[PDB]
Amino acid sequence: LDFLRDRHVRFFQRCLQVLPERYSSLETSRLTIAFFALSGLDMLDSLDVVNKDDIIEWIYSLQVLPTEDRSNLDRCGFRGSSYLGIPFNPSKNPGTAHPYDSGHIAMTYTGLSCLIILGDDLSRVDKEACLAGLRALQLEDGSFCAVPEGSENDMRFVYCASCICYMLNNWSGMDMKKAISYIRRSMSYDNGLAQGAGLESHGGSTFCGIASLCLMGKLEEVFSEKELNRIKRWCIMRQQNGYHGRPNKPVDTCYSFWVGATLKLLKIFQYTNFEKNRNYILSTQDRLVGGFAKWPDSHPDALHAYFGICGLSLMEESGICKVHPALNVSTRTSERLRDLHQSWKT
Amino acid sequence: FLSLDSPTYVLYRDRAEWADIDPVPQNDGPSPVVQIIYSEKFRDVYDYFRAVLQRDERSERAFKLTRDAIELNAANYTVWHFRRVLLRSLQKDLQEEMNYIIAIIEEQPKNYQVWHHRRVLVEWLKDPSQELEFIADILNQDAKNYHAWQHRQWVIQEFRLWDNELQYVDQLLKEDVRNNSVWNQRHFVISNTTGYSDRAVLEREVQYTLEMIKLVPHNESAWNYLKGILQDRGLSRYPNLLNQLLDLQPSHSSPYLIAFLVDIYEDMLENQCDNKEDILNKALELCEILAKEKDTIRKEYWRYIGRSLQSKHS
């Protein structure tokens, strides 16, 4: 069918407004929901329908700044939301101590990403504090945890770290050698990339791995041509019509981006079947409320709405900006970032 | 104790035991973004959680409060961390906590925080005795649950429990030979025990896989395992394999087989084999068979593969 663009713009708008208590389990990840909506509007070139300034202040109120004594550097970054009860402070005053207030790697990533998308120049971001916090999260094996207090560790956070370093245009935030080691060790016998060594290769972790390497600009340097060919084969094999995340698993709209973007980074997305992919993605479009779901005749959400749109973007949908396959922002925004970096370099 | 849905449930704001604590509210400033609306009960539990948390109160009442916070939202990673802090401070019975988390995970098998919590507990107790069985149960409501397999590999590796995994794998593969997670588990076990260097083992495995392939010829997983355990030793270094596959082609054909063949042929060209120009043709012939009729959805890919072989061996 057709792409109900305006319907989707309204959808993202509502997401930025209010959510039903039914989404209470996203409380600590609200910033990533904001990202899906904002980057989603960006991708549809409709950022005008929101107040960039209000949102920017909200985002900055989520930054965990170093305290007077700077004894909390290892815990700086961004919060997913205000769930801890810390008094609203748009990175105006110094950090107010709190036994359990720390950043979350995925929130620092989506936070910075949102700020860039909204046009902010990151001047109020304590770049050094964030990088300090990032370093603190990396493990001996090269992977990362989400929070200093401890958490599971896997490829998801490796990608987050990469995005943070890339956006702050400073890789002192990680031990790139160890990170690359982790990424290599995650390659499976079937040639896909898993969440970690020995685990089942997966579309999500493969994207995270490849995209991270691309962000570091070491794809070719880390994997041999033979290796890259095997990886490409594994990825291209994910297309059934839409894309699934693992062999013998049903397709899911979001993989049109996870895998699609990987194929794009590997320069072979062009050899995939566009029509069947586009057709599937659209079959999951909610023509009534807007957005997309993982499967057809299923309820839509911010994640699939965003990734379904980015999936369409990969094939240059009429009416959708080109998404930067490795940074997960519109090319337009990836560019504004290039300019931003130049600015600093003076 | 007092359940959140109990007819006699009372808001913390109305509980004597909590009179001394001032609830701490959440505030998203002037213009809240992606704001979730909360019920009286919900906001009540968390307004007190913030209070206790903010004061790092290692109390017994705090411990009980986390149970409610977790019931309201088990995805709140901070609540779980604090609960763990309390578990230690109050020196709680960890074997009891194991029962707790076991129930929680059953209800929310796709929650990251609950699996992490269980892993920490098992590390603390250094007791993996009930892990393999628990995971087997979770794998029953979803044999491909990534969280379950991840936890399973951790346990097995950490406490060296390989003795029965290969058997568990054999059993699950019988229940569904298409479960890619189980094939991965199989490779995990073997490569971490005997390894594939023992020609006796390699043979057993290649044989085992060919058997599964014959039962369900169209199964990417089985084919990926087969190619996986041989691709690094050199697919062309196995003359009998090429012919055994060519023999299947008639009855057990699938795009997976054809692809395997193309790969064998490419390994040969890779190792300056005899009939360079002849082999390349057998390959190209297959690439096209894939593009035009066998794996049409990847038509442009296969053609791309073909063009790549020609410009590389001519």
């Binding site: 990840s29 995925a106 993982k294 | -």
Partner: peptide, 5 residues
């Protein structure tokens, strides 16, 4: 649904 956190 796809819970990634």
């Amino acid at each position: 649904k796809c819970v990634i956190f």
